[PDB]
Amino acid sequence: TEQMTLRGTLKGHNGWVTQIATTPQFPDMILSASRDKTIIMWKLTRDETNYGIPQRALRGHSHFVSDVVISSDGQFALSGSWDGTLRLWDLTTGTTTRRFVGHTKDVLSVAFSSDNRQIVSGSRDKTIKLWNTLGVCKYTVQDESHSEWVSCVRFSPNSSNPIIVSCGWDKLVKVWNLANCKLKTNHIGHTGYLNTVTVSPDGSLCASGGKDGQAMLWDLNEGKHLYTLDGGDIINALCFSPNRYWLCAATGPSIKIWDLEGKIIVDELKQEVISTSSKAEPPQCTSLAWSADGQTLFAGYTDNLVRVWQVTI
């Protein structure tokens, strides 16, 4: 029915954006992690010249910051980095409140609870650790856990289900029970390593994308493979629209949005000023997240730029 467009580019990174975390509270602000040491808290001015200007840098991690997530309040911000530690940033002042130490290898993913009480951390040591906001590793999964890395973890917005999701490089999506701290069900079928998992705003179904380019859906009510969407390229990051009935995918260079009702592409989003014309790979999209009102889509590529995608019609 329509076509997305760029409003502008956000330019304040040296290393390429590994995660973009949005917030419902502050709409003139976005927080993005990066492949450098920085995590940029932006300021969205919406000018002719610059849509977004960098306000604050959260420096402190030894190595690459792979995952960032904002508190529901918009006062703290949690980041997971390859240094093998987590940071919980005082987002107002721009300093570490708590620094969580326990993971052996590179921490790939981290998430809050909806209440900002529980913290789940996926790392390359084949483990998922449960943290409080005062730095105590309350439980660690070891016995029946992933055979490879924990590439992504997300929570159920549904408080009725004490259920979390975890994709791995073992080519399995595991669903865990928060209360008893051991898995409800496994999800076998997806071939190739998994990069991402996003849980729907409902807390009812979950999309797992990875190497295959096959975004398989997974119902949380009854663990059943609903249907598969063909990305085309490798899938890097998925995100369900908060208000709309749209699933988004970061498929190689393109951002590919589907309608959930009709299993058909709404838009494929690429560069318009193409410079990879001769024996050059386009700068592939790696992380993206829908805005507060489900109007704007922020997307971090491998060229150190955050590109924005607003609805025109």
Binding site: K184, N186, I188, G189, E222
Partner: protein, 41 residues
């Protein structure tokens, strides 16, 4: 005498030669296509 390598570290040293790159074998894993769950509790 050039000693052989043993992780036990009795008959020789415990650190392998810097030249030697021991690559572990990938397990014979079978690729699925079936809708599979494993619910319990």
């Amino acid at each position: 005498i050039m000693l052989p390598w043993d992780p036990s570290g009795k008959i020789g040293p415990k650190k392998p030669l810097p030249d030697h790159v021991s690559i572990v074998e990938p397990k014979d894993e079978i690729l699925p296509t079936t809708p599979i769950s494993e619910q319990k509790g």
